[PDB]
Amino acid sequence: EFNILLATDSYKVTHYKQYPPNTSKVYSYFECREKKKYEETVFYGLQYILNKYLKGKVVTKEKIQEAKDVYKEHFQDDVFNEKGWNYILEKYDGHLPIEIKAVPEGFVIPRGNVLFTVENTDPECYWLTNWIETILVQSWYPITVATNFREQKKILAKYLLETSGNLDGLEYKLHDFGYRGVSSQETAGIGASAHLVNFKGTDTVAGLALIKKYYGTKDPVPGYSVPAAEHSTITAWGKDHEKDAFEHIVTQFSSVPVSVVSDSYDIYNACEKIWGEDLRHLIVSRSTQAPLIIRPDSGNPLDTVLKVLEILGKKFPVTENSKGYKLLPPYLRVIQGDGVDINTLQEIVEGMKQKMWSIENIAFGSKLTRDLLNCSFKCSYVVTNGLGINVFKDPVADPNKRSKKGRLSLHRTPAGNFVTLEEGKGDLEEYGQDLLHTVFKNGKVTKSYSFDEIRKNAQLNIELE
Amino acid sequence: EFNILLATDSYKVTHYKQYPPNTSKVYSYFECREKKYEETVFYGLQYILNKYLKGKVVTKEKIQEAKDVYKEHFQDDVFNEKGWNYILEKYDGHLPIEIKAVPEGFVIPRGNVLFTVENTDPECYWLTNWIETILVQSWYPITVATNFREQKKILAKYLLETSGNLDGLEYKLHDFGYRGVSSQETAGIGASAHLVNFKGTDTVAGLALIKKYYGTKDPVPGYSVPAAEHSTITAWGKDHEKDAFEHIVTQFSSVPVSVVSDSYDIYNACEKIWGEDLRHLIVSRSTQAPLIIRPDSGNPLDTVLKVLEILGKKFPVTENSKGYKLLPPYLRVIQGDGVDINTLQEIVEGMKQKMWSIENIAFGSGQKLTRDLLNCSFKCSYVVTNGLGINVFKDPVADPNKRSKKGRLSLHRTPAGNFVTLEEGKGDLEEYGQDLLHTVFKNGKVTKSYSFDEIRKNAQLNIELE
Ligand SMILES: O=C(NCc1ccc(S(=O)(=O)c2cccc(C(F)(F)F)c2)cc1)c1cnc2n[nH]cc2c1
Ligand SMILES: O=C(NCc1ccc(S(=O)(=O)c2cccc(C(F)(F)F)c2)cc1)c1cnc2n[nH]cc2c1
């Protein structure tokens, strides 16, 4: 079973002995620190952490003893605030005396703004605020995944709109292929849920169950897939029988969309001779609701996509849409799922546009770090001897690492943007309502968002228009 | 509860229908495909076998669950309910799969077979690649273990050159990465991979994982000591940094303590606060209880060098037998900002050039490694259809680097004592001695395992082996 007493950075076990004596409050905040482009971030994923790890009776006698035993060996010393944890157990039935206030999930907020704050609700637990920094800071991952996919969606939207005149199918243009490529089963679920804030096509099944458990959708599921081959289902037929594999597979899935990886031996031969001649009669007969989706999976991503389109355009009837761009027949599409990151995605759609190919023709299949958006948790306010003091770091050699001072609040500006007020200036009430809401207090999740609301919050402007 | 029927890439749910008719065997393998990082540490499969693959992993409820989910996910009935029911009924939900692997901790050159997977029942030909997704995640502990071993080689080289020995090497790179990984589970797995190489960690999650899945003779595989963070310094107020420092070193007067010193001005903190105002509290400390000063901002190399020069002028420095400068034993430095394998190299070389021993410094690790770094990859190499075995492979025209191995594979020692992978069942010709892979999983049971102590021994540096 998960033990919150064992879910912090080791050194934090020793911090209760280091704060100023007579400190009754430690108040901390999380931001995606501005850096002297990723100018706005999607706040997403805190609700998962709150429910899975922070809520309810998270302290027990057994958990305290377990931690005591582990830390004794780990530190070769008895340092461990057994009394402090006992107090939470006895006084609060093992519920964390913490209040967390956060911007609503799905909100798109410029860099350098307070996203959530954390403080102890009982003076005895001044040490607890930063104990849980480690676990809360891992919110950097769903925030950065949600943000990065939103930025990729902006690129796709721009090019789809320009080449087609509309945004039809946009939410299925970037399919999550990343399950095998992440570091763990837990990460797979979290990352997939963040992808699904932006898109609806996924092969990372783990994301569905996480969304259902922690967030919820009106629809039975938040994400979808369709049949497709992998190299093993093609190569198993033998090198001389690729055509036989293709035929079997498209015939098995004759009435649903089917994607078929076509580069096992020679992608260009597969497109021109196998799909484009030998099996063409099985493709042109397919429904608009059940296209063949050809998947190249190797070579230079841009060069290969363009050459594949060029080949298919000469073997199948191409039309020109009202924007002047070339469009494959509705029973035939292409998906590129090799080497697609935000930079290469841009390169491909731009390259397609230059060659007069509509983005309607293509879909894509998809490391990020905590430093990308400078996700950071810092103490900004403490009360010592009954006096509040505004605290901060400001390293001489790096002004980019300066932190905010005092009690914080987030507000709409008169022009409708965002501003973070420091030093308790929100109390002056010159800027309307604080946009941070209490989401956790004393062991209870106090405000929750559905996955539907989060998706709405995270919409692109071009979608709103 | 984890459900293996829901732990694969969605498209794999449809593959049972796509293999050639009458296929009785699918056989696949994992390698770190050949294209720095010429040898990889094989580590982490044992966790996956025990946590996810062994025992009764199929139940009626899990089958119904997957059926319901996939019906909505695919907007159609495509899920192989019958195939999973067969495993439930015939094998009491244990997977009819055999896995053979190189021993955990082994250091093996790129492009060798590391593990193989095949079905042991003809009805379950589709099962081999169902579990590709789960098994391929072994890329992460392999890559973490490998990258940290490569960092250890750099540290060993420079520590040996500047001090004449390797004392303290296993405490020279401390894991600071708990907050910077993607999940609690990843934290435990990644920390365990770090601990294959080192013994100092702040990622507590790693200890319990090692204890549960691997085991050590010692109570714990990794250690830490007290240290400050910016909040425990800055909480005292901007004008009271000295008061914070004094309190902390006094609270931890008889154990090692690390104090971050860059909250406002690292150079002033070192020269005036530590080096003058509080010097009397430092020079009185035991060799077993040093102050470890931690800069945490600025150019990592430039900052380390300036911090050492400052301390060198305020504290008595000696010259060791190799001619390098050494701080007194009650005083050390740790650099935990911006340290990846490249910057680690730049710092130790920069120190060497300025005649500072590597004894003076430790590093904190806390750059993202991906599955592409070592080209970790799982591919089908052999199938049996209509009773005939066939050697299979991909070989994409535009990328020869993605060509996969053919046929049944085995791992062997060459006459010179190196590794070679034999393809096309050639291992059976008995010209290269015994297959070095061991069966580690068969029919729902883990059949061979390794303690964490043995894994560490397997992963040792040559320089450590002397
Ligand atoms: O092909 C794969 N999965 C199936 C798949 C995914 C995505 C598409 S798609 O063309 O985006 C598409 C088409 C129609 C409906 C949907 C829908 F509405 F359902 F989203 C998605 C079609 C098929 C695949 C391929 N390679 C992989 N490597 N690692 C994981 C992988 C997964
Ligand atoms: O200082 C931190 N943790 C405590 C710590 C770690 C490492 C050292 S060390 O100097 O390598 C050292 C010294 C003596 C014994 C050990 C031993 F034998 F115990 F390993 C380690 C001393 C203290 C720390 C600092 N910043 C962090 N950011 N994110 C996580 C962080 C952890």
Numbering used by the authors:
A (entry chain A): 8 to 43, 53 to 382, 389 to 487
B (entry chain B): 8 to 42, 53 to 383, 388 to 487
What did the article's authors report about this structure?
NAMPT functions as a homo-dimeric enzyme that catalyzes the rate limiting step in the primary salvage pathway for NAD synthesis, the transfer of a phosphoribosyl residue from 5-phosphoribosyl-1-pyrophosphate (PRPP) to nicotinamide (NAM) to produce nicotinamide mononucleotide (NMN). Crystal structures of NAMPT in numerous ligand-bound forms have been reported. These structures consistently display a NAMPT homo-dimer with two essentially identical active sites at the dimer interface. Typical NAMPT inhibitors were found to occupy the portion of active site responsible for NAM binding and a tunnel-shaped cavity extending from the NAM binding site. Furthermore, we determine the crystal structures of six NAMPT mutants in the apo form and in complex with various inhibitors and present a definitive model to explain the differential effects of the mutations on various structural classes of NAMPT inhibitors.
The RD cell line with the S165F mutation is almost 1000-fold resistant to GNE-618, but only10-fold and 100-fold resistant to APO866 and GMX1778, respectively, demonstrating that inhibitors from distinct classes are differentially affected. Cell lines harboring S165F, S165Y, or G217A are preferentially resistant to GNE-618 compared to GMX1778 and APO866. The identification of resistance mutations in S165 was surprising because this residue does not lie within the drug-binding pocket. However, the part of NAMPT structure that is responsible for inhibitor binding is not affected by the S165 mutations. However, expression of S165F/Y mutant NAMPT allows cell survival in the presence of GNE-618, implying that the mutant NAMPT retains a level of enzymatic activity to support sufficient NAD production for cell survival. However, expression of S165F or S165Y mutant NAMPT proteins in a naïve cell line resulted in decreased sensitivity to GNE-618, indicating that these mutations are sufficient to cause resistance to this NAMPT inhibitor.
